[PDB]
């Protein structure tokens, strides 16, 4: 399946991809203002992402760091990346579907649009400008709003026993983005589309 990843912002970003222990594609690549990266994912992949970081500075053997969404230093990305991140998720021909979600679960640092370029279902989106409006005790300093799990590690944020609910910090990013999860055990916003779709991820879908 290809996906184009488009940066809308108006700053580079660095799109990472990876499906936890493996990068998917090349798992990484620079994007300045209005670039394109298609990648091509294997089929029957399951739990794949992709997210965006942030103020990156890499060297010549591509080694550095990332203030936001950073995966072990790496420019190629082989596994999931710091929070806060803004998360395209999704698994690939799983008994004839496929399954994509946006997801706030590990916090936001940009905003994005996750559609299908085939036909028969629809898109999500997740474009509010949640960094600005982020309570206090989640501002990451670094950049971006982080989940409250990372934040306060406690087993009602993390649903650590499979019980949790909505919580003050929860309802916040469900507030500003309905189509995402807030939480774990969230009421599902994923969408079912055909088996071997295409798709587009776009960061900062609107002006």
């Not at 700053?11 to 499906?19: C, D, E, R």
């Not at 370029?117 to 999500?124: A, D, E, L």
């Amino acid at each position: 399946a290809t996906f184009e990843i488009v940066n809308r912002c108006s700053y580079t970003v660095w799109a990472a991809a990876s499906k936890g222990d493996a990068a998917l594609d090349a798992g990484g690549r620079q994007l300045n203002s209005g670039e394109s990266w298609t990648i091509n994912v294997e089929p029957g992949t399951n739990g794949g992402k992709i997210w965006a970081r942030t103020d990156c500075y890499f060297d010549d053997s591509g080694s550095g760091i990332c203030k936001t969404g950073d995966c072990g230093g790496l420019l190629r990305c082989k596994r999931f990346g710091r929070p806060p991140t803004t998360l395209a998720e999704f698994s690939l021909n799983q008994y004839g579907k496929d399954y994509i979600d946006i997801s706030n679960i590990k916090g936001f640092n940009v905003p994005m649009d996750f559609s299908p370029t085939t036909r028969g279902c629809r898109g999500v989106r997740c474009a509010a400008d949640i960094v600005g409006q982020c309570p206090a005790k989640l501002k990451a300093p670094g950049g971006g709003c982080n989940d409250a799990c990372t934040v306060f590690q406690t087993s009602e944020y993390c649903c650590t026993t499979g019980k949790c609910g909505p919580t003050e910090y929860s309802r916040f990013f469900k507030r500003l983005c309905p189509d995402a999860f807030s939480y774990v055990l969230d009421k599902p916003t994923t969408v079912t589309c055909p088996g071997s779709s295409n798709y587009r991820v776009t960061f900062c879908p609107t002006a």
